[PDB]
UniProtKB/Swiss-Prot annotation, chain A:
Organism: Severe acute respiratory syndrome coronavirus 2 (2019-nCoV)
Effect on the protein of changing S25F: In strain: Omicron/BA.1, Omicron/BA.2, Omicron/BA.2.12.1, Omicron/BA.2.75, Omicron/BA.4, Omicron/BA.5, Omicron/BQ.1.1, Omicron/XBB.1.5, Omicron/EG.5.1
Subunit structure: Binds to host ACE2. RBD also interacts with the N-linked glycan on 'Asn-90' of ACE2. Cleavage of S generates a polybasic C-terminal sequence on S1 that binds to host Neuropilin-1 (NRP1) and Neuropilin-2 (NRP2) receptors. Interacts with host integrin alpha-5/beta-1 (ITGA5:ITGB1) and with ACE2 in complex with integrin alpha-5/beta-1 (ITGA5:ITGB1). May interact via cytoplasmic c-terminus with M protein. May interact (via N-terminus) with host bilirubin and biliverdin, thereby preventing antibody binding to the SARS-CoV-2 spike NTD via an allosteric mechanism.
Impact after mutating S23P: In strain: Omicron/BA.1, Omicron/BA.2, Omicron/BA.2.12.1, Omicron/BA.2.75, Omicron/BA.4, Omicron/BA.5, Omicron/BQ.1.1, Omicron/XBB.1.5, Omicron/EG.5.1
Source superkingdom: Viruses
Residues of the full protein shown: 351 to 400 of 1273
UniProt-reported outcome of changing S21L: In strain: Omicron/BA.1
Function field: Attaches the virion to the cell membrane by interacting with host receptor, initiating the infection. The major receptor is host ACE2. When S2/S2' has been cleaved, binding to the receptor triggers direct fusion at the cell membrane. When S2/S2' has not been cleaved, binding to the receptor results in internalization of the virus by endocytosis using host TFRC and GRM2 and leading to fusion of the virion membrane with the host endosomal membrane. Alternatively, may use NRP1/NRP2 and integrin as entry receptors.
Name of this protein: Spike protein S1
Length: 50, 50
């Protein structure tokens, strides 16, 4: 209910960084295949971690 | 009964039919044709309903 929407930026994105330190349960990104999310150049992703 | 492929590795040449369909692998977590993670099947059905 109080999930934070935070802007993180001024750095370089990544996608394979989630395959080493996070033991997965689900990994889904809809609207774009997760594969390119390393090269994708986001504009101030409104990070929602909860 | 009417189906349509939903997954493939490479695109098609114009007027190309390919039938060989094992359990597609959506990147890492190797599918080994054993339906692991990121394993969706290219075979997809429609919603042909009155």
């Amino acid at each position: 209910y109080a999930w934070n929407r935070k802007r993180i930026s001024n750095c370089v994105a990544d996608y394979s960084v989630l395959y080493n330190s996070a033991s997965f349960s689900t990994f889904k990104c809809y609207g774009v295949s997760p594969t390119k999310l390393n090269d994708l150049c986001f504009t101030n992703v409104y990070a929602d971690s909860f | 009964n009417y189906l349509y492929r939903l997954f493939r590795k490479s695109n098609l040449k114009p007027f190309e039919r390919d039938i060989s369909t094992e359990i597609y692998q959506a990147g890492s977590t190797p599918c080994n044709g054993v339906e692991g993670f990121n394993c969706y099947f290219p075979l997809q059905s429609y919603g042909f309903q009155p």
